[PDB]
Amino acid sequence: MYIHQQQQKNSGTLEERVRALGDRVDCINSQLNRVL
Amino acid sequence: MYIHQQQQKNSGTLEERVRALGDRVDCINSQLNRVL
Numbered sequence: 001m002y003i004h005q006q007q008q009k010n011s012g013t014l015e016e017r018v019r020a021l022g023d024r025v026d027c028i029n030s031q032l033n034r035v036l
Numbered sequence: 037m038y039i040h041q042q043q044q045k046n047s048g049t050l051e052e053r054v055r056a057l058g059d060r061v062d063c064i065n066s067q068l069n070r071v072l
């Protein structure tokens with residue numbers, strides 16, 4: 001439970017949120033290239 | 037009015053803006069999967 005809470009704190013940090021955000025928009029760009 | 041201003045300050049924080057941003061791009065990915 002402590003390891004899981006630290007992982008939720010690290011994934012809840014702002015830099016990791018922006019990095020996962022960038023991964024999400026890379027997935028959006030990849031799927032839009034698959035549509036195109 | 038003080039509760040509303042504190043809610044606008046919390047929603048105006050940078051971490052909550054990035055979290056709502058990630059929710060917006062999750063909605064974009066969901067609607068693009070609905071198009072696909």
